[PDB]
Write a protein that binds this ligand. Structure first.
Ligand SMILES: [Mg+2]
Length: 78
RNA sequence: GUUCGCGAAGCUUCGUGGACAUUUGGUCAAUUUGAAACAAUACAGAGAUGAUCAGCAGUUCCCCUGCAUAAGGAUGAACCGUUUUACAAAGAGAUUU
């Protein structure tokens, strides 16, 4: 099992290396093939449970989130 | 077209008023682009445990075969990994006011 895992990891790194090599060309990372209608847990958001609308509700939270996300764009860029 | 009445020409023929009968079918339109699977090649490859092997379950936002609430599917599939805080009390030494 461990060996299999290791192999998988190796494969993944190889893939990454390949993409790095062919970076000047536009390249997309291959997704794990689905077996019987599953979720790719990047998109969609998985089975979300609510924030639960409370009494002392303030709208700065959204702003904060946006701010947080701004930084990650920068990271992506670099 | 059927016909039951009226009006003109020669029971036969035209012109009319009515009655009869009355709204089908499509969640679909014919080849690639609205989603079938096996197969094949290559590559590995078989539950515990030292090894070999049986069977049963269990969890799941995985299913298949099965008439099935039988039974069977690699022990049917994935589970084998990650694992640092409701965290306080006492003692000793050090820098800052
Ligand atoms: Mg068996």
């Amino acid at each position: 099992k461990i060996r299999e895992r290791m192999l998988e990891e190796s494969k993944r790194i190889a893939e990454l290396q390949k993409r790095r090599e062919l970076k000047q060309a536009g390249i997309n990372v291959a997704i794990k093939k689905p077996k019987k209608k599953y979720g790719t847990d990047i998109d969609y958001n998985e089975d979300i449970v609510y924030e639960q609308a409370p009494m002392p509700g303030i709208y700065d939270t959204s702003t904060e989130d946006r701010q947080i996300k701004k930084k990650f764009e920068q990271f992506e860029r670099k």
